[PDB]
Nucleic acid binder design. Structure first.
Ligand SMILES: [Mg+2]
Lengths: 1111, 85
DNA sequence: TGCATCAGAGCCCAAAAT
DNA sequence: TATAATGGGAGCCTCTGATGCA
């Protein structure tokens, strides 16, 4: 079909690789493809160099290598394995006395490998490591909140790599240093570095009143040894001040690169702030037997200069993105790697004492368990390690680009106020101002902007075009926020003829402040409007017409869109939807130019230029983390000539290579009989008839058979007391057959368990005796379909013990997995949304004859209430509908870029050409204006919509240019009294579906200690009737309703039993008894040595334990 | 050290099995199977006994183990009570 | 007797937690 | 049951109330 694209802005560079923030970070961390001699000291390599040599015999690090993965990715997901590589290190043990050297390559366990798309496979499940924003290491000067004319100097290193130091000028006038919560006069620390009054007086004298607060006679009297011992006694009271002990502690606090690490970014920021050059990442050095200063004197000089008001000295904005940096996958993982390595080193030193001091190898010295555990802990249990969101391809791409201020080494949610959550001016071009969570995490979880990239230091940079004279170059410079602040940057839409700025006054930013400026003053210019927003936000057409609060929901909800069997790309696109599919890695493309040899549902064979025959297998109906079906479909035919980068297969949610999150439906904006009320949505049954909004879902079920002290669990078709009706669809072995339809209550995998030893009650003795049937030894433990679930069985995996290639966890004889698939039609309670933040649940499905319809007989698909628009201020959905109407009749789709889009005149032009197709056709077919069309026209000229005196055709065209048409009520045949807005809208079916959420319980499982119902649908849980619900019952004065909630419907054991028995017998429910959790409370207070006594009116004890707990 | 107390000699056997498995993983470049551990342990050891020994050596896990990234739920809250009718 | 400094006390609900 | 062995290690909010200093 035709695709007409609007907008004149030419973007000189394409979007960067969208997952590069993940992929490149990890590549740098492993340095796997670099030959060892060529490795830089970074990532894993830097961790080894930091941990070694291990001194005590001396064990030294030579080099590491990474092997190949024991199993490929597909296999790991199948077998619940982690995709990982064996890590080895060549280590040499040396005896410094003897000279003896034994060298060996020790196996350190495995390290997880990142897949092509930037994710991990950890125990079979796909995971994402979310980048973490935090304070850049460095030296900052912030204002002291208590004392206005004073400031605090904070020296910050990398996390866990050293203490923070705070410099303050106390009211008494002496300059104090705060380390690990202890304060002392800084003069003492200066003396340890070897500074003398002569050097300090001349250096800081320029600032009058402050230098005297630094002068302390007693400190200068003592030599560097006495000052160092004095400081150690101040910092570590009670620890004997052995001279070697003090040097060791202070060295570790200041000069040790192993215990103190400023960043590489920390070093640059300090050097840049204080105007010096650092020999390393430490605040000082240990050289020639003494300590030699690096940092302290320059920060002190700047600190005094700030207090005195010397020109050129500023306080630092700590939310500026120059002072805030990103810790990506490589850095986070390497940190945990460094931790595991330190633990392993502890074991080495401990092993270097015991055993024989003579015969020892590196293999005998190293226990790798601490390292394996540190890495295993990071990937499974870290907060930044998240279950991948792969609801649709855009979901995971977005997940990889998210930025969190939470996690280890970061903000808590209550401790995070407005400042961090704010959109800083420096977020421009770096962090999307739109895409952030609604609710408690707002401003804490953010998203990388589309053109943004994280530099080697960890700062987010954004591209700008150089502007020389009035000429805009094509050379793009990626800038940090700090460097961006130097220039005057014109907006990307400023008019150009050729490379020249064509306006007399241009719109630019200087340090974020908007200003009108001459082309002579323009140093750079934005690459595109796309650079201000995230990828999801960049997918919203007419975004300039939507209030940001709704665009937020629009961005976020594209993440929740379900892949549809009929999915289509929107008729109004933004031009990013092709790139998103390509970077997502869902779609399949041709490597080189070639011709297609074979095309199957399962595979595509391509013959390239090289002559080599390449076969691409297709992933068919695979279950994602969220259970949506990932399946690839061949888009080419046998004998087709393809070029390099031509589409071979569509992934999920893509149509011919374009991102397809939904369907294009015909919408009428109008109230409908209250089924539209308060965001509810009315849809036509035609949508189900033609399988729009239908999605495939797969659920995985699992069961283990294990050894017991009572005998084996067995997976079997022989299950006590079950009819052949019940076993019909089970195979010989007891597993449900592929292709069977399973419904709630149905057996998936049959299983028997040996009955726990019990004496049958005398009732069972008599019952067994009456019927003459031996009580079986085993019980029916079979796995069944839970309430509300079921579908068609598409797969079964069975793994026994003692069969080739498989070993289970101890005690487990066999494991069975049953994959059940369901084709889900859209239904009442399902949630729909568009890209502008319009969201609603389907409240009514009308038959086609009730649907409002056009004069030519076409019923609309969806009816959206206009009451949702004005308060929300998202008008983009309206413009999308208007342009969607033109495209419906012209048979075309559009690309309207964000902020450089189709404007109203152009949309009107298309609407005019469309009206010719919608109407001119009719006049030739021999039909004139309808009577009811005249009536609608009458009310319309009363509304000022049409010009009086024009022909009926002319007036209908005037309305059509306003995007309104005459609409017939399918119930009556009479028109809607006014012309109504109708058009094509792009609407998605979100992941929140009633089938998943509907739940009810009569009685069910109870908790161990409290005896209260369990929680959640998966546990067959009860609803929580919480503190606030109780208040409601209290305010109503419903005492008996409330008492039921508190006793018979919860933890009153005697009461709940009696209530059930009464209801099945038709009696009224009995009076409640004591709730079991009150008995727990009494006993818990007795465990605390408090005697809690229930008393009667005579103040005599009442026993709520009924004699059972008293001797 | 163990919530479920184990006889000192049995702890010795468990620890030997650990060292052995660690040797095998250090020479084999991957975790050993039950059978590989059984060879390394010598006569008297088959794969079944290695598994049974590992089963006996399993330590309990806390009922107060967190579920989720909020502090709001415990592992024990999801465990039904099979004792009371 | 009047005033800092610090220790300890709190910081929504339900759903879910793969 | 026996060479001698002799002092540890990690670390980063607001209001209210009691307590320890002018
Ligand atoms: Mg909660």
């Amino acid at each position: 079909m035709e695709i007409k694209r609007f907008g004149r802005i030419r973007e000189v560079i394409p979007l960067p690789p969208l997952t590069e923030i993940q992929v490149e970070s990890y590549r740098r961390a492993l340095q796997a493809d670099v030959p060892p001699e060529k490795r830089e000291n970074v990532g894993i390599q830097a961790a080894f160099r930091e941990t070694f040599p291990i001194e005590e015999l001396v064990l030294d690090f030579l080099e590491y290598r990474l092997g190949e993965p024991p199993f490929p990715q597909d296999e790991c997901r199948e077998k619940d394995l982690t995709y990982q590589a064996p890590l080895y290190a060549r280590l040499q043990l040396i005896h410094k006395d003897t000279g003896l050297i034994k060298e060996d390559e020790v196996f350190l366990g495995h390290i997880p490998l990142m897949t092509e798309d930037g994710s991990f496979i950890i125990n079979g499940a796909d995971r994402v490591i979310v980048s973490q924003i935090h304070r850049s290491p460095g030296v900052y000067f912030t204002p002291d909140p208590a004392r206005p004319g004073r400031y605090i100097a904070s020296i910050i290193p990398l996390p866990k790599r050293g203490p923070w130091i705070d410099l303050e000028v106390e009211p008494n006038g002496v300059v104090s240093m705060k380390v690990n919560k202890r304060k002392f006069p800084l003069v003492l620390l200066l003396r340890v570095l070897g500074y003398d009054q002569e050097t300090l007086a001349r250096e800081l004298g320029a600032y009058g009143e402050l230098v005297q607060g630094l002068m302390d006679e007693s400190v200068f009297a003592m030599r560097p040894e006495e000052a160092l011992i004095r400081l150690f006694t101040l910092l570590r009271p009670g620890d004997p001040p052995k001279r070697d002990k003090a040097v060791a502690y202070v060295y570790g606090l200041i000069a040790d690169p192993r215990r103190y690490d400023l960043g590489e970014a920390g070093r640059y920021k300090a050097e840049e702030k204080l105007g010096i050059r650092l020999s390393g990442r430490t605040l000082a050095r240990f050289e020639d037997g003494e300590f030699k200063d690096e940092v302290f004197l320059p920060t002190l000089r700047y600190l005094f200069a700030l207090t005195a008001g010397v020109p050129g000295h500023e306080v630092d904005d700590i939310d500026h993105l120059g002072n805030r940096r990103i810790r990506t996958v490589g850095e986070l993982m390497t940190d945990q790697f460094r931790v595991g390595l330190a633990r392993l080193a502890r074991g080495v030193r401990e092993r270097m004492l015991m055993g024989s001091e003579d015969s020892l190898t590196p293999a005998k010295l190293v226990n790798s368990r601490p390292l394996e555990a540190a890495i295993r802990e990071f990937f499974s249990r870290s907060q930044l390690s998240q279950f991948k969101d792969e609801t649709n391809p855009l979901s995971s791409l977005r997940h990889k680009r998210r930025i969190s201020a939470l996690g280890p080494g970061g903000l808590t949610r209550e401790r995070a106020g407005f400042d961090v959550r704010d959109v800083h001016r420096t977020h421009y071009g770096r962090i999307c101002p739109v895409e952030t969570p609604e609710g408690a995490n707002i401003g804490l979880i953010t998203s990388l902007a589309a053109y943004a990239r994280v530099d080697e230091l960890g700062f987010i940079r954004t591209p700008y075009r150089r502007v020389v004279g009035g000429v805009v170059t094509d050379e793009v410079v990626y800038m940090t926020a700090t460097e961006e602040d130097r220039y005057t940057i014109a907006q990307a839409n400023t008019p150009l003829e050729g490379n020249r700025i064509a306006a007399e006054r241009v719109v630019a930013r200087r340090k974020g402040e908007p200003v009108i400026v001459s082309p002579e003053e323009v140093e750079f210019m934005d690459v595109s409007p796309k650079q201000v927003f995230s990828v999801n936000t960049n997918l919203i057409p007419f975004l300039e017409h939507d209030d940001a609060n709704r665009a937020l929901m629009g961005s976020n909800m594209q993440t929740q869109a379900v892949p549809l069997i009929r999915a289509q790309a929107p008729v109004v696109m933004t031009g990013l939807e092709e790139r998103v599919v390509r970077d997502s890695l869902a779609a399949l493309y041709a490597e080189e130019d070639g011709e297609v040899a074979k095309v199957d549902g399962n595979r595509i064979v391509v013959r390239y230029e090289d002559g080599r025959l390449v076969e691409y297998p297709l992933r068919r109906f695979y279950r994602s983390n969220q259970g949506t079906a990932l399946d690839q479909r061949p888009r080419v035919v046998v004998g087709q000539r393809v070029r390099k980068g031509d589409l071979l297969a569509d992934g999920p949610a893509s149509e011919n290579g374009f991102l397809a999150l939904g369907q294009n439906v015909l919408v009428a904006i109008m109230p409908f009989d209250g089924y539209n009320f308060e965001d509810a949505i009315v849809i036509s049954e035609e949508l189900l008839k033609r399988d729009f909004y239908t999605s495939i879902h797969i659920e995985r079920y699992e069961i283990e058979a294990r050894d017991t002290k009572l005998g084996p669990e067995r997976i079997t078709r022989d299950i006590p007391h079950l009819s052949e009706a019940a076993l019909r669809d089970l195979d010989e072995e007891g597993v449900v057959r592929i292709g069977a339809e399973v419904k709630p209550g149905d057996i998936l995998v049959g299983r028997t368990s040996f009955k726990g030893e019990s004496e049958p009650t005398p009732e069972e003795r008599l019952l067994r005796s009456i019927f003459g049937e031996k009580a079986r030894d085993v019980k029916d433990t079979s796995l069944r379909v839970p309430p509300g679930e079921g579908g068609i069985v598409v797969r079964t995996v069975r793994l026994r013990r003692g069969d080739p290639g498989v070993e289970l966890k101890p005690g487990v004889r066999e494991v069975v997995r049953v994959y059940v698939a369901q084709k889900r039609k859209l239904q009442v309670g399902d949630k729909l949304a568009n890209r502008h933040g319009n969201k609603g649940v389907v409240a009514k499905i009308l038959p086609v004859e009730d649907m409002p319809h056009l004069p030519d007989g076409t019923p609309v698909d969806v009816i959206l209430n206009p009451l949702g628009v004005p308060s929300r201020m998202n008008l983009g959905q309206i413009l999308e509908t208007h342009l969607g109407l033109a495209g419906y009749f012209l048979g075309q789709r559009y690309i309207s870029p964000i902020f450089d889009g189709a404007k109203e005149p152009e949309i009107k032009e298309l609407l005019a050409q469309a009206f010719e197709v919608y109407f001119g056709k009719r006049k030739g077919e021999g039909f004139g204006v309808d009577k009811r069309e005249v009536e609608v026209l009458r009310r319309a000229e009363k509304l000022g919509l049409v010009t009086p005196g024009k022909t009926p055709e002319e007036q209908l065209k005037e309305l059509f240019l306003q995007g309104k048409v005459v609409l017939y009520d399918g119930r009556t045949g009479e028109p809607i009294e006014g012309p109504i807005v109708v058009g094509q809208m792009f609407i998605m079916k979100l992941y929140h579906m009633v089938e998943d959420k509907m739940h009810a319980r009569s009685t069910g499982p109870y908790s161990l200690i409290t005896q209260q119902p369990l929680g959640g649908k998966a546990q067959f849980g009860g609803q929580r009737f919480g503190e606030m619900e109780v208040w409601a019952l209290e305010a109503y004065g419903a005492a008996h309703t409330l008492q039921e909630m508190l006793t018979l419907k919860s933890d009153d054991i005697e009461g709940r039993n009696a209530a059930y028995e009464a209801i099945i017998k038709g009696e009224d429910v009995p009076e409640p008894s004591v709730p079991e959790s009150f008995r727990v409370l009494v006993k818990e207070l007795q465990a605390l040595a408090l005697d809690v006594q229930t008393l009667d009116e005579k103040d005599n004890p009442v026993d709520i334990f009924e004699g059972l707990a008293s001797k | 050290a163990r919530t479920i107390r184990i006889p000192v000699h049995m702890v010795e056997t468990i620890n030997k099995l650990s060292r052995t498995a660690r040797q095998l993983q250090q020479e084999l470049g991957r975790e050993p199977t039950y059978e590989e551990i059984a060879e390394a342990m010598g006569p008297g050891w088959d794969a079944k006994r290695v598994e049974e020994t590992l089963k006996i050596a399993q330590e309990p896990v806390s009922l107060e183990t967190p579920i989720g990234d909020e502090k709001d739920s415990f592992y024990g809250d999801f465990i039904p009570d099979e004792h009371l009718p």
